[PDB]
Amino acid sequence: PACYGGFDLYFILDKSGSVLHHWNEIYYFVEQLAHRFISPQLRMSFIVFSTRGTTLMKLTEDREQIRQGLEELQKVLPGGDTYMHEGFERASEQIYYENSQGYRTASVIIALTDGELHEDLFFYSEREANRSRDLGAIVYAVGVKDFNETQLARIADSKDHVFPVNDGFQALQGIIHSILKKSC
Ligand code: NA
């Protein structure tokens, strides 16, 4: 698959208890990237996870829906366990559905998290992120706090795909460059 005509962005956002003082950083990354142009065929989805993984806004190219979705993200109060594997399950379900319809788009997952996962929860996040990659998704991890980059490199496609959220304006540019390289 050398290039694609359109790109679907999947934000998978950690709203567990360990990221409480950092939700604003997570929101602001998402809000800055959600506003960029990226592609003439840009759709995005907002997925949040803590005790479960929930699709807060289904894939859409409509700016008003995105705007409302950003408003629900401003309301988030972090708390609970860190079930990141369900977050990926939510994106993989939307991905498989879209390719099942006559839709050939690239899938880009952006997972924002502190990486603070017990071994079992990490074990199944890695498996579900590998499940997304078989679905053709490219996975980036945007690390929050003093994130463990060795763990995130296993969730993301590589160490190349792990960026700190604190300098993520540079990371946005880096993520968007990879989209452009793969843009027919
Ligand atoms: Na966490």
Swiss-Prot record:
A divalent metal cation binds at S16, S18, T82. Residues 8-179 form the VWFA domain. Glycans are attached at N130, N148. Glycosylated. Residues 1-184 are extracellular. It is found in: Cell membrane; Cell projection, Lamellipodium membrane; Cell projection, Filopodium membrane. Disulfide bonds join C3-C184. Belongs to the ATR family. Plays a role in cell attachment and migration. Interacts with extracellular matrix proteins and with the actin cytoskeleton and thereby plays an important role in normal extracellular matrix (ECM) homeostasis. Mediates adhesion of cells to type 1 collagen and gelatin, reorganization of the actin cytoskeleton and promotes cell spreading. Plays a role in the angiogenic response of cultured umbilical vein endothelial cells. May also act as a receptor for PLAU. Upon ligand binding, stimulates the phosphorylation of EGFR and ERK1/2. Interacts with gelatin and type 1 collagen. Interacts with the actin cytoskeleton. This is Anthrax toxin receptor 1.
